[PDB]
Amino acid sequence: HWGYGKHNGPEHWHKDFPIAKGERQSPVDIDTHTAKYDPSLKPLSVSYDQATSLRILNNGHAFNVEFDDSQDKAVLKGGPLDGTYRLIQFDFHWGSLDGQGSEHTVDKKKYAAELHLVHWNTKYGDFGKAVQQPDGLAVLGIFLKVGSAKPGLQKVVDVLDSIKTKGKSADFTNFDPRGLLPESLDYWTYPGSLTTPPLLECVTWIVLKEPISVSSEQVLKFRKLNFNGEGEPEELMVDNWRPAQPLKNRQIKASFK
Numbered sequence: 145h146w147g148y149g150k151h152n153g154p155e156h157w158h159k160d161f162p163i164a165k166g167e168r169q170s171p172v173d174i175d176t177h178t179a180k181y182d183p184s185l186k187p188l189s190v191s192y193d194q195a196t197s198l199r200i201l202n203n204g205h206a207f208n209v210e211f212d213d214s215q216d217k218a219v220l221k222g223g224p225l226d227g228t229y230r231l232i233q234f235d236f237h238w239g240s241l242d243g244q245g246s247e248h249t250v251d252k253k254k255y256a257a258e259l260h261l262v263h264w265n266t267k268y269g270d271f272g273k274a275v276q277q278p279d280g281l282a283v284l285g286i287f288l289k290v291g292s293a294k295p296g297l298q299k300v301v302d303v304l305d306s307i308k309t310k311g312k313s314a315d316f317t318n319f320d321p322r323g324l325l326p327e328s329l330d331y332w333t334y335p336g337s338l339t340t341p342p343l344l345e346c347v348t349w350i351v352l353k354e355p356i357s358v359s360s361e362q363v364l365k366f367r368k369l370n371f372n373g374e375g376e377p378e379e380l381m382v383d384n385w386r387p388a389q390p391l392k393n394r395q396i397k398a399s400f401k
């Protein structure tokens with residue numbers, strides 16, 4: 145199966161997922177000087193007041209926090225989006241060192257990690273039907289830098305010890321994903337794909353310009369997770385990021401002047 149190692153990492157994925165070399169792959173490098181302000185963007189609306197988290201899962205590649213998406217309770221709308229997109233999960237990607245870890249880059253700069261808040265277009269009824277559609281998903285991407293602790297992250301960090309290995313999960317109710325956001329909603333947007341197999345080309349990416357700060361201790365705890373399952377040789381879960389892919393025939397638009 146696929147992963148992030150020398151043998152099964154991003155440069156191998158195309159053999160089983162040929163869309164890896166497609167026309168709208170993610171992540172990309174965001175060249176800030178080439179991105180253009182777009183006045184046709186409507187204001188972005190992140191409405192997570194009634195978000196209902198369920199469970200946190202180590203899937204052998206990263207960890208996922210899962211949400212109950214059976215009602216319109218945590219939605220993203222506006223910006224480049226037509227209609228309403230419902231939050232299903234968040235996931236992170238991070239590095240073995242603070243100088244790398246993010247998937248998107250900004251003028252070639254890599255951040256220490258990247259958070260993805262994944263939403264599906266409610267016009268398609270559920271996640272699996274949405275990922276067959278070119279506008280099925282919207283992923284809100286948020287960069288993490290190392291500096292001050294992010295208090296809203298700490299409940300995640302403290303639960304990781306209970307999901308150290310592949311296939312482990314834990315209850316993760318009553319977690320408020322609002323505490324993971326930066327102050328500003330200024331963003332870049334472009335059409336792209338999932339960044340892990342199956343690499344489906346269904347995503348409107350909305351990448352926030354303002355990073356959040358997390359502490360060195362918080363990110364160190366991410367790097368104590370394991371890719372392997374229980375009772376197997378330890379392979380620390382680090383560097384679970386895909387590098388930037390060709391921009392091809394795409395334009396990155398900015399929400400801000």
Ligand SMILES: NS(=O)(=O)c1ccccc1
Pocket residue numbers: 145146147151152153156157158159160161
């Ligand atoms: N192409 S892939 O899914 O990364 C893969 C790589 C090596 C062995 C099996 C699968």
Ligand SMILES: NS(=O)(=O)c1ccccc1
Pocket residue numbers: 235260262283337338339340341
């Ligand atoms: N890492 S990502 O592009 O946001 C993603 C979300 C759901 C499934 C697979 C990948």
Ligand SMILES: [Zn+2]
Pocket residue numbers: 235236237259260339
């Ligand atoms: Zn992700």
